[PDB]
């Protein structure tokens, strides 16, 4: 909520390395202490200026608009068929913004526009460009996993570990890595032999799953043999919902009117907010995480044509302005969600922005000392939903539906996805 003033007052213009080779992955790397991570992220969220909160909100919206921009594929987003159909606008923006660090003129000047630039509408060069955006995007994570008024364990978790797997003898630069440090604490650069893709792909999975502790939907898929860099962001979302329980008896679902599927469920009793648009036939309920964070469940009224309805769940300013806040007694009923999901940004973005071409272009430098030829720039998510033990509305999701977790404090939607069937 809700408006935005325009200030159209014309004025007289104004404004304002030690490289290192990473070790092999065979080296014993300790796993990520997830408690230690989130406890550091809440501190980052706590020790944060009122000006920084606006910046976190701003970088949030940029991530939102980039996600809506990316729907310019026109229902081909799920065409990037790896794991469950769900992408992270904030992770996408971040992974893209981190490549911006390693970018000179042209390449940086493209990502500037492609990422969503220029945050300030200018490039006077400072600690904000690349460094401000990254640490602002760190903030938005802490803003999600907050529980400000809650104090006690909010139960929602957001881990984001950025793998930066270079080729052998690739002396990647120091200040770039400190830039990545601003975006996420868990920055794991480690060398790998890409000449053998089969051997690299299997070991790259064995490393991450060992380090992280969650099964990612494959890795190094569709990567060329003649490559060096592999900038892969790995995210994991935990989302516990109080007043919910897992059912031993499956209710089952219909991916389409003919076929059926044996699948789990999560019964929900509570008075949530929900309002159904009768113009385009819509309906959306939620199950807030300290209000700050909110899981919005977009239900297609008829559920006949999702592709048309779901299109209005990536539609610019409308999805956010959907905020009447009309409370109602609702019996929530939805499938138990525990699915992975990979998608390569270079496959995810194309034509309108055509970064695939821009990625294999020479100009990087600030990251690349030697020759960089990226095999994949992957975003892998592990979305997980959990439970902690007179008149109503029986809102069941028996047929396919849409959803998206959104943060009010950072005005940013961390996840958006579709559910055809759990498998």
């Amino acid at each position: 909520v809700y408006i935005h003033p325009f200030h159209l007052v014309i004025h007289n213009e104004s404004t304002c390395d030690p490289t290192f080779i990473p070790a092999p992955i065979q080296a014993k790397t300790s796993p990520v202490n997830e408690k230690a991570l989130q406890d550091q992220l809440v501190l980052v969220a706590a020790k944060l200026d009122t000006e920084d909160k606006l910046r976190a909100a701003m970088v949030g919206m940029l991530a939102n608009f980039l996600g809506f921009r990316i729907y310019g594929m026109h229902s081909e987003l799920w065409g990037v068929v790896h794991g469950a159909t769900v992408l992270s606008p904030t992770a996408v923006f971040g992974t893209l913004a981190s490549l911006y660090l390693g970018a000179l003129d042209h390449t940086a000047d493209r990502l500037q526009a492609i990422l969503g630039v220029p945050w300030k509408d200018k490039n006077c060069t400072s600690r904000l460009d690349a460094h401000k955006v990254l640490s602002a995007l760190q903030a938005v994570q802490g803003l999600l996993v907050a529980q400000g008024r809650a104090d006690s364990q909010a139960q929602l978790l957001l881990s984001t570990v950025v793998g930066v797997f270079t080729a052998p003898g690739l002396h990647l630069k120091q200040p770039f890595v400190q830039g990545l440090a601003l975006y996420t604490p868990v920055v794991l650069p480690r060398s790998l032999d890409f000449t053998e893709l089969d051997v690299a792909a299997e070991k790259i999975d064995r490393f991450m799953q060992a380090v992280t502790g969650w099964k990612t939907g494959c890795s190094l898929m569709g990567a060329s043999v003649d490559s060096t860099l592999a900038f892969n962001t790995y995210v994991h979302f935990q989302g516990k919902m109080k007043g919910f329980s897992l059912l031993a008896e499956p209710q089952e679902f219909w991916v389409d009117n003919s076929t059926s599927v044996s699948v789990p469920m999560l019964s929900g009793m509570g008075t949530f907010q929900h309002w159904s648009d009768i113009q385009d036939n819509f309906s959306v309920t939620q199950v807030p995480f300290t209000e700050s964070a909110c899981l919005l469940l977009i239900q297609p009224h008829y559920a006949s044509d999702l592709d048309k309805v779901e299109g209005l769940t990536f539609q610019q300013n409308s999805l956010n302005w959907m905020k009447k806040l009309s409370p109602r007694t609702i019996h929530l009923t939805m499938p138990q969600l525990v699915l992975q999901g990979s998608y390569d940004l270079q496959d995810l973005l194309a034509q309108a922005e055509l970064p695939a071409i821009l990625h294999t272009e020479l100009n990087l430098q600030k990251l690349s000392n030697d020759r960089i030829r990226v095999g994949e720039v992957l975003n892998s998510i592990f979305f997980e939903l959990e439970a902690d033990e007179p008149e109503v509305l029986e809102v069941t999701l028996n047929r396919p539906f849409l959803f998206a977790v959104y943060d009010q404090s950072a005005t940013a939607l961390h996840f958006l996805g579709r559910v055809a069937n759990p498998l």
């Binding site: 003033p5 200030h7 007052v9 014309i10 004025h11 980039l66 630039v117």
Partner: protein
């Protein structure tokens, strides 16, 4: 000649203009605060999402287009656009003029993704025009067709006509009483002397005088950071990143804000400046008054935008370098 305006959420007032042959249509805001004309260009990289979401001028589809190519950057209070100059015929409210305008190739997602309009038509003087490009109103006047060297703005309440601009005069249908003029401090800027600003019962602002920029392109009434801090403290409003809020249940209780201009008191009621979205004490309601530090030489200065114009029909008189106000109808 009159231009029909569309009112979007009470923050963006825009009308249509046609550029080229055949005409390519664009939604534009008419801004007395700037003097250049610009629309998004077909040459704008689609990496700028704002360009993907707006009408783009394509010179290769206009037979009346005249190349120039001079680079220009336009810096506004809330954002910047950059591109190059081009000339073509522009249709505005029935009048046809050859005009030099900017084709924008760099248009930041924030804030332009939030723009309903595509571009801007500067209604300011040539003294503030970037690149010394003749402003569209000077070009129309040079035709010698208008009955008066003046233009007028009518901005309606949100409702849901959104508003209306009259080139050449004023529309008696949208104002009552008579006009009361204030002479411009200087030609080249639609800025006037403001004798004082009062909140409730205590003229605790702009004592000893200050400046007021009558800005049709500004969504809100703005003052310097120091002035707004005082005004807001007096209102009991809390400051946020981009605005000031008040608990909704107290919006109707907020005092009147008055603006002393040319020996007349222009008063706004709380209904006039607060976005009364609800009345709950558990909700926040934004105020149509912001803090905006406008840089020299034009600033520091207060800015009287839509919030003010909605209440008072405004006439900008080029022939006498004055501005007239009258109760909007």
């Amino acid at each position: 000649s009159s231009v029909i305006l569309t009112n979007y959420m009470d923050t963006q007032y825009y009308g249509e203009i046609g550029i080229g042959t055949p005409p390519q249509t664009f939604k534009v805001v008419f801004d007395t605060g700037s003097s250049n004309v610009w629309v998004p260009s077909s040459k704008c990289s689609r990496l700028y999402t704002a360009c993907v979401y707006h009408k783009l001028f394509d010179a290769s589809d206009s037979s009346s287009y005249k190349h120039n190519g001079t680079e220009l950057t336009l810096r506004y209070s809330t954002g910047t656009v950059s591109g190059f100059l081009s000339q073509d015929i522009i249709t505005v409210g029935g009048i046809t003029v050859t005009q030099m305008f900017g084709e924008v190739t760099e248009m930041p997602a924030l804030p332009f993704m939030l723009a309903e309009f595509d571009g801007v038509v500067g209604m300011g003087f040539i003294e503030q025009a970037i690149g010394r490009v003749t402003p569209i109103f000077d070009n129309i006047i040079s035709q010698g067709v208008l009955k008066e060297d003046v233009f007028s703005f009518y901005y309606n309440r949100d409702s849901e006509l959104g508003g209306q601009i009259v080139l050449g005069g004023s529309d008696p249908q949208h104002y009552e009483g008579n006009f009361h003029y204030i002479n411009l401090i200087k030609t080249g800027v639609w800025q006037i002397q403001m004798k004082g600003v009062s909140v409730g019962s205590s003229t605790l602002l702009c004592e000893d005088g200050c400046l007021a920029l009558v800005d049709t392109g500004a969504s809100y009434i703005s003052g310097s950071t120091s002035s707004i801090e005082k005004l807001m403290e007096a209102l009991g409003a809390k400051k946020r990143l981009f605005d000031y809020v008040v608990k909704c249940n107290e919006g109707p209780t907020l005092p009147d804000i008055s603006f002393h201009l040319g020996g007349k008191e222009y008063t706004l009621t709380s209904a006039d400046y607060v976005f009364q979205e609800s009345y709950s004490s558990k909700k926040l309601c934004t105020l149509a008054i912001h803090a905006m530090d406008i840089p020299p030489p034009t600033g520091p200065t207060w800015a009287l935008g839509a919030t003010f114009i909605r209440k008072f029909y405004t006439e900008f008189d080029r022939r006498n370098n004055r501005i007239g106000f009258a109760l909007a109808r």
